[PDB]
mmCIF file of C-alpha atoms in Angstrom:
data_model
loop_
_atom_site.group_PDB
_atom_site.id
_atom_site.type_symbol
_atom_site.label_atom_id
_atom_site.label_comp_id
_atom_site.label_asym_id
_atom_site.label_seq_id
_atom_site.Cartn_x
_atom_site.Cartn_y
_atom_site.Cartn_z
ATOM 1 C CA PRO A 204 -50.685 63.394 -6.034
ATOM 2 C CA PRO A 205 -50.761 59.585 -5.920
ATOM 3 C CA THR A 206 -53.860 57.678 -4.856
ATOM 4 C CA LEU A 207 -53.149 55.569 -1.779
ATOM 5 C CA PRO A 208 -55.074 52.296 -2.268
ATOM 6 C CA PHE A 209 -57.736 51.366 0.268
ATOM 7 C CA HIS A 210 -56.982 48.850 3.019
ATOM 8 C CA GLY A 211 -59.441 48.115 5.812
ATOM 9 C CA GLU A 212 -62.141 45.705 6.987
ATOM 10 C CA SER A 213 -64.961 45.782 9.511
ATOM 11 C CA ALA A 214 -64.451 43.804 12.709
ATOM 12 C CA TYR A 215 -67.406 41.563 11.837
ATOM 13 C CA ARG A 216 -65.782 40.273 8.651
ATOM 14 C CA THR A 217 -62.353 39.655 10.195
ATOM 15 C CA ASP A 218 -63.605 37.629 13.187
ATOM 16 C CA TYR A 219 -66.870 36.012 12.030
ATOM 17 C CA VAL A 220 -65.380 33.978 9.179
ATOM 18 C CA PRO A 221 -66.757 30.607 7.996
ATOM 19 C CA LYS A 222 -65.092 27.977 10.110
ATOM 20 C CA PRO A 223 -64.087 24.306 9.819
ATOM 21 C CA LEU A 224 -66.921 22.234 11.235
ATOM 22 C CA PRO A 225 -66.061 19.881 14.125
ATOM 23 C CA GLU A 226 -65.310 16.306 13.074
ATOM 24 C CA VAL A 227 -67.696 14.409 15.349
ATOM 25 C CA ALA A 228 -68.514 10.752 14.670
ATOM 26 C CA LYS A 229 -68.747 8.712 17.870
ATOM 27 C CA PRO A 230 -71.712 6.721 19.215
ATOM 28 C CA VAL A 231 -72.112 5.238 22.703
ATOM 29 C CA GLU A 232 -71.266 1.585 22.111
ATOM 30 C CA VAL A 233 -72.386 -0.718 24.927
ATOM 31 C CA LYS A 234 -71.584 -4.400 25.425
ATOM 32 C CA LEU A 235 -74.391 -6.580 26.731
ATOM 33 C CA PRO A 236 -73.320 -8.923 29.548
ATOM 34 C CA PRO A 237 -74.142 -12.554 28.739
ATOM 35 C CA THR A 238 -76.890 -14.022 30.884
ATOM 36 C CA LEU A 239 -75.690 -16.796 33.116
ATOM 37 C CA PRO A 240 -77.796 -19.973 32.905
ATOM 38 C CA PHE A 241 -80.699 -20.620 35.266
ATOM 39 C CA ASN A 242 -79.258 -23.345 37.502
ATOM 40 C CA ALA A 243 -81.987 -23.369 40.136
ATOM 41 C CA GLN A 244 -84.261 -26.170 41.308
ATOM 42 C CA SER A 245 -87.449 -26.246 43.326
ATOM 43 C CA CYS A 246 -87.486 -28.188 46.592
ATOM 44 C CA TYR A 247 -90.163 -30.608 45.383
ATOM 45 C CA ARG A 248 -87.817 -31.226 42.378
ATOM 46 C CA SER A 249 -84.941 -32.087 44.768
ATOM 47 C CA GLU A 250 -86.046 -34.898 47.095
ATOM 48 C CA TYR A 251 -89.540 -35.854 45.840
ATOM 49 C CA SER V 2 -62.372 28.021 -0.152
ATOM 50 C CA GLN V 3 -60.513 28.022 3.156
ATOM 51 C CA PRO V 4 -59.522 30.463 4.547
ATOM 52 C CA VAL V 5 -60.087 32.581 1.433
ATOM 53 C CA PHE V 6 -61.329 32.087 -2.113
ATOM 54 C CA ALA V 7 -59.121 34.183 -4.421
ATOM 55 C CA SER V 8 -55.850 32.432 -3.632
ATOM 56 C CA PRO V 9 -53.405 30.728 -6.006
ATOM 57 C CA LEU V 10 -53.399 27.656 -3.766
ATOM 58 C CA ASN V 11 -57.200 27.673 -3.899
ATOM 59 C CA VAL V 12 -57.543 27.982 -7.681
ATOM 60 C CA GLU V 13 -55.137 25.064 -8.137
ATOM 61 C CA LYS V 14 -56.918 22.976 -5.497
ATOM 62 C CA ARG V 15 -60.282 23.105 -7.244
ATOM 63 C CA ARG V 16 -58.867 22.825 -10.774
ATOM 64 C CA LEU V 17 -56.857 19.688 -10.011
ATOM 65 C CA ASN V 18 -59.505 17.909 -7.939
ATOM 66 C CA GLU V 19 -62.248 18.461 -10.507
ATOM 67 C CA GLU V 20 -59.804 17.246 -13.168
ATOM 68 C CA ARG V 21 -59.507 13.924 -11.351
ATOM 69 C CA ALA V 22 -63.259 14.062 -10.705
ATOM 70 C CA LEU V 23 -64.090 14.330 -14.408
ATOM 71 C CA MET V 24 -61.768 11.422 -15.190
ATOM 72 C CA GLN V 25 -63.321 9.131 -12.579
ATOM 73 C CA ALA V 26 -66.773 10.200 -13.786
ATOM 74 C CA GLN V 27 -65.997 9.009 -17.321
ATOM 75 C CA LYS V 28 -64.298 5.855 -15.997
ATOM 76 C CA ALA V 29 -67.417 4.929 -14.002
ATOM 77 C CA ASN V 35 -73.724 9.017 -10.049
ATOM 78 C CA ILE V 36 -71.442 11.527 -8.315
ATOM 79 C CA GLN V 37 -71.829 15.228 -7.595
ATOM 80 C CA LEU V 38 -69.844 17.965 -9.342
ATOM 81 C CA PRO V 39 -67.935 20.101 -8.438
ATOM 82 C CA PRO V 40 -66.327 18.173 -5.531
ATOM 83 C CA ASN V 41 -66.864 19.282 -1.957
ATOM 84 C CA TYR V 42 -64.241 21.141 0.046
ATOM 85 C CA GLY V 43 -63.853 18.202 2.424
ATOM 86 C CA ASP V 44 -62.731 16.093 -0.535
ATOM 87 C CA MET V 45 -60.139 18.708 -1.528
ATOM 88 C CA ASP V 46 -56.746 17.002 -1.271
ATOM 89 C CA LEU V 47 -53.350 18.336 -2.304
ATOM 90 C CA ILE V 48 -49.691 18.527 -1.474
ATOM 91 C CA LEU V 49 -48.871 21.952 -0.075
ATOM 92 C CA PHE V 50 -45.091 21.852 -0.274
ATOM 93 C CA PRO V 51 -43.832 20.087 -3.426
ATOM 94 C CA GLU V 52 -40.837 17.773 -3.619
ATOM 95 C CA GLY V 53 -38.224 20.521 -3.976
ATOM 96 C CA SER V 54 -39.488 23.394 -1.818
ATOM 97 C CA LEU V 55 -38.382 23.078 1.812
ATOM 98 C CA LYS V 56 -34.732 23.113 2.851
ATOM 99 C CA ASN V 57 -32.744 23.813 6.014
ATOM 100 C CA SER V 58 -29.159 25.105 6.128
ATOM 101 C CA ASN V 59 -26.683 23.736 3.533
ATOM 102 C CA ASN V 60 -29.596 23.873 1.019
ATOM 103 C CA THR V 61 -30.513 20.206 1.505
ATOM 104 C CA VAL V 62 -34.137 19.348 0.739
ATOM 105 C CA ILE V 63 -36.243 17.492 3.315
ATOM 106 C CA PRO V 64 -39.422 15.647 2.244
ATOM 107 C CA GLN V 65 -42.711 16.466 3.918
ATOM 108 C CA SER V 66 -42.997 12.958 5.357
ATOM 109 C CA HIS V 67 -40.718 14.323 8.089
ATOM 110 C CA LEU V 68 -43.204 17.102 8.876
ATOM 111 C CA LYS V 69 -46.056 14.843 10.024
ATOM 112 C CA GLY V 70 -46.760 14.482 13.726
ATOM 113 C CA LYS V 71 -45.573 18.038 14.456
ATOM 114 C CA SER V 72 -46.973 21.582 14.420
ATOM 115 C CA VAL V 73 -45.560 23.506 11.451
ATOM 116 C CA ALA V 74 -46.041 27.257 11.064
ATOM 117 C CA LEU V 75 -45.126 29.790 8.402
ATOM 118 C CA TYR V 76 -43.135 32.811 9.607
ATOM 119 C CA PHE V 77 -43.868 35.622 7.169
ATOM 120 C CA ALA V 78 -40.957 37.949 7.732
ATOM 121 C CA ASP V 79 -38.590 40.561 6.338
ATOM 122 C CA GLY V 80 -35.031 41.274 7.430
ATOM 123 C CA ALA V 81 -35.373 45.038 6.978
ATOM 124 C CA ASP V 82 -38.664 45.596 8.814
ATOM 125 C CA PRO V 83 -37.844 46.536 12.426
ATOM 126 C CA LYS V 84 -41.091 45.026 13.698
ATOM 127 C CA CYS V 85 -39.708 41.702 12.511
ATOM 128 C CA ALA V 86 -36.195 42.208 13.890
ATOM 129 C CA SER V 87 -37.669 42.489 17.385
ATOM 130 C CA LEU V 88 -39.431 39.146 16.907
ATOM 131 C CA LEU V 89 -36.430 37.047 15.794
ATOM 132 C CA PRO V 90 -34.815 36.484 19.245
ATOM 133 C CA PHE V 91 -38.191 35.693 20.803
ATOM 134 C CA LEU V 92 -39.085 33.207 18.059
ATOM 135 C CA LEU V 93 -35.591 31.677 18.114
ATOM 136 C CA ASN V 94 -35.823 31.245 21.880
ATOM 137 C CA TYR V 95 -39.358 29.847 21.676
ATOM 138 C CA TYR V 96 -38.559 27.358 18.896
ATOM 139 C CA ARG V 97 -35.352 26.230 20.598
ATOM 140 C CA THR V 98 -37.025 25.367 23.911
ATOM 141 C CA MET V 99 -39.752 23.314 22.222
ATOM 142 C CA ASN V 100 -37.484 20.948 20.323
ATOM 143 C CA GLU V 101 -34.957 20.308 23.108
ATOM 144 C CA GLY V 102 -37.491 19.346 25.755
ATOM 145 C CA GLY V 103 -38.551 15.839 24.825
ATOM 146 C CA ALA V 104 -37.818 12.767 22.768
ATOM 147 C CA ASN V 105 -39.096 14.352 19.544
ATOM 148 C CA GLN V 106 -39.372 17.792 17.987
ATOM 149 C CA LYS V 107 -42.702 19.440 18.818
ATOM 150 C CA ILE V 108 -43.031 22.457 16.507
ATOM 151 C CA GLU V 109 -41.473 23.488 13.209
ATOM 152 C CA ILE V 110 -41.118 26.830 11.398
ATOM 153 C CA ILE V 111 -41.224 27.329 7.626
ATOM 154 C CA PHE V 112 -39.494 30.629 6.884
ATOM 155 C CA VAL V 113 -41.165 32.797 4.231
ATOM 156 C CA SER V 114 -39.175 35.896 3.281
ATOM 157 C CA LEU V 115 -39.986 39.330 1.849
ATOM 158 C CA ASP V 116 -36.381 40.361 1.271
ATOM 159 C CA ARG V 117 -35.123 42.369 -1.701
ATOM 160 C CA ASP V 118 -32.341 40.350 -3.349
ATOM 161 C CA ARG V 119 -30.027 37.349 -2.995
ATOM 162 C CA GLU V 120 -27.826 38.994 -0.356
ATOM 163 C CA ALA V 121 -30.803 40.028 1.768
ATOM 164 C CA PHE V 122 -32.136 36.465 2.025
ATOM 165 C CA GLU V 123 -28.853 34.831 3.052
ATOM 166 C CA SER V 124 -28.032 37.505 5.635
ATOM 167 C CA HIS V 125 -31.346 36.754 7.360
ATOM 168 C CA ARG V 126 -31.030 32.968 6.842
ATOM 169 C CA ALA V 127 -27.787 32.593 8.812
ATOM 170 C CA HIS V 128 -29.342 33.413 12.203
ATOM 171 C CA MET V 129 -31.982 30.668 12.327
ATOM 172 C CA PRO V 130 -32.005 26.852 12.148
ATOM 173 C CA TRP V 131 -35.456 25.772 10.931
ATOM 174 C CA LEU V 132 -36.659 25.260 7.371
ATOM 175 C CA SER V 133 -37.365 27.802 4.634
ATOM 176 C CA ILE V 134 -38.818 28.341 1.189
ATOM 177 C CA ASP V 135 -36.589 29.946 -1.437
ATOM 178 C CA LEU V 136 -37.473 33.546 -2.282
ATOM 179 C CA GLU V 137 -36.868 33.109 -6.014
ATOM 180 C CA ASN V 138 -39.159 30.080 -6.043
ATOM 181 C CA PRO V 139 -42.639 31.376 -7.008
ATOM 182 C CA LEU V 140 -44.359 29.606 -4.086
ATOM 183 C CA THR V 141 -43.253 32.394 -1.717
ATOM 184 C CA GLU V 142 -45.549 34.738 -3.650
ATOM 185 C CA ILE V 143 -48.203 32.011 -3.732
ATOM 186 C CA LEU V 144 -48.544 31.737 0.067
ATOM 187 C CA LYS V 145 -48.760 35.494 0.736
ATOM 188 C CA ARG V 146 -51.810 35.876 -1.473
ATOM 189 C CA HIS V 147 -53.235 32.799 0.250
ATOM 190 C CA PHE V 148 -52.984 34.147 3.814
ATOM 191 C CA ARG V 149 -53.410 37.873 2.957
ATOM 192 C CA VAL V 150 -50.016 38.594 4.523
ATOM 193 C CA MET V 151 -48.667 41.681 2.784
ATOM 194 C CA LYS V 152 -46.665 44.764 3.761
ATOM 195 C CA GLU V 153 -47.766 47.614 1.485
ATOM 196 C CA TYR V 154 -50.551 47.629 -1.072
ATOM 197 C CA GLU V 155 -49.185 46.866 -4.532
ATOM 198 C CA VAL V 156 -50.920 43.590 -5.423
ATOM 199 C CA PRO V 157 -54.734 44.005 -5.490
ATOM 200 C CA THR V 158 -56.475 41.936 -2.832
ATOM 201 C CA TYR V 159 -59.905 40.752 -3.852
ATOM 202 C CA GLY V 160 -62.201 42.817 -1.676
ATOM 203 C CA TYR V 161 -60.315 41.643 1.414
ATOM 204 C CA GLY V 162 -58.000 43.623 3.638
ATOM 205 C CA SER V 163 -54.501 43.177 4.954
ATOM 206 C CA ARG V 164 -55.002 40.308 7.392
ATOM 207 C CA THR V 165 -51.646 41.160 8.973
ATOM 208 C CA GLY V 166 -48.434 42.951 8.115
ATOM 209 C CA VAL V 167 -44.841 41.878 8.590
ATOM 210 C CA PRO V 168 -44.265 39.929 10.783
ATOM 211 C CA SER V 169 -46.724 37.101 11.381
ATOM 212 C CA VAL V 170 -46.670 33.498 12.551
ATOM 213 C CA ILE V 171 -49.523 31.389 11.183
ATOM 214 C CA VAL V 172 -49.913 27.689 11.950
ATOM 215 C CA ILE V 173 -51.213 25.685 9.003
ATOM 216 C CA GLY V 174 -53.147 22.504 8.328
ATOM 217 C CA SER V 175 -52.717 19.776 5.739
ATOM 218 C CA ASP V 176 -55.321 21.111 3.289
ATOM 219 C CA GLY V 177 -53.894 24.629 3.585
ATOM 220 C CA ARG V 178 -56.365 26.069 6.097
ATOM 221 C CA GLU V 179 -55.279 28.383 8.871
ATOM 222 C CA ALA V 180 -55.540 26.697 12.262
ATOM 223 C CA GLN V 181 -55.074 29.606 14.662
ATOM 224 C CA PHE V 182 -53.569 33.025 14.073
ATOM 225 C CA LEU V 183 -50.868 34.249 16.414
ATOM 226 C CA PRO V 184 -51.716 37.939 17.015
ATOM 227 C CA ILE V 185 -48.346 39.683 17.119
ATOM 228 C CA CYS V 186 -49.571 42.680 15.083
ATOM 229 C CA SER V 187 -53.288 42.020 14.640
ATOM 230 C CA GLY V 188 -56.596 42.974 16.219
ATOM 231 C CA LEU V 189 -54.934 42.013 19.515
ATOM 232 C CA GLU V 190 -51.549 43.707 18.791
ATOM 233 C CA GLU V 191 -49.961 41.498 21.478
ATOM 234 C CA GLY V 192 -46.458 41.492 20.068
ATOM 235 C CA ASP V 193 -43.588 39.480 21.604
ATOM 236 C CA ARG V 194 -46.067 37.453 23.711
ATOM 237 C CA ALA V 195 -48.533 35.983 21.182
ATOM 238 C CA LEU V 196 -46.159 33.047 20.636
ATOM 239 C CA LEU V 197 -47.268 31.642 24.006
ATOM 240 C CA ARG V 198 -50.788 31.157 22.594
ATOM 241 C CA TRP V 199 -49.515 28.622 20.045
ATOM 242 C CA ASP V 200 -50.751 25.201 21.111
ATOM 243 C CA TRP V 201 -49.721 22.049 19.273
ATOM 244 C CA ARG V 202 -52.070 19.273 20.413
ATOM 245 C CA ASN V 203 -54.823 20.291 17.985
ATOM 246 C CA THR V 204 -52.735 21.923 15.240
ATOM 247 C CA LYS V 205 -51.062 18.687 14.169
ATOM 248 C CA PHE V 206 -49.961 18.303 10.546
ATOM 249 C CA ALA V 207 -51.607 15.221 9.053
#
């Protein structure tokens, strides 16, 4: 009689396979608002 | 080494990329052998894919879409049930929009010249020629095989005929459609094929 060759795998080795890692490269880039100039005068600087 | 190791695509990936790595090493502090992320190749060569009338199409047309091999045989009655569902599914994708969404590369397990062309007349997408050796090369890459004659390398039959597997640029499997698989959800596993993430770069 012929020998039927073996086919079969456990469920762990057919589902838990090494996987492509996620391609993550993204920081949180923030833009600083420019400070508006200090255009303020004291009263004693105005009329005196 | 994705998805498997003992594949004819795999052994030609590493051999060619270390060949260019050794040349750039002697033309120049780099690591050997190269990493799998640096593995680059062309999957389908310049004269592989062709639609009806046997006209070749370059793979620059394939980018921006979701291509998927359809490992099939015209005599297997599992497969014959899946032709009108795959024809209907592929047809509705490509009509509904400005551009074609998916694409199917037909890979055949027929017996002779007459068996290929009798199957080939019922379908409009691309194909790989049976007599071209690359048909044998992709089966032993994806472990898609009907009956055990070629020795797999400690693996098992990942799936029998038929199967639809969506592929990536470097040859990896993206998601498996479980027609006859651990899920066995035949004639409805085609609905699980998304195309936003499985885009051919």
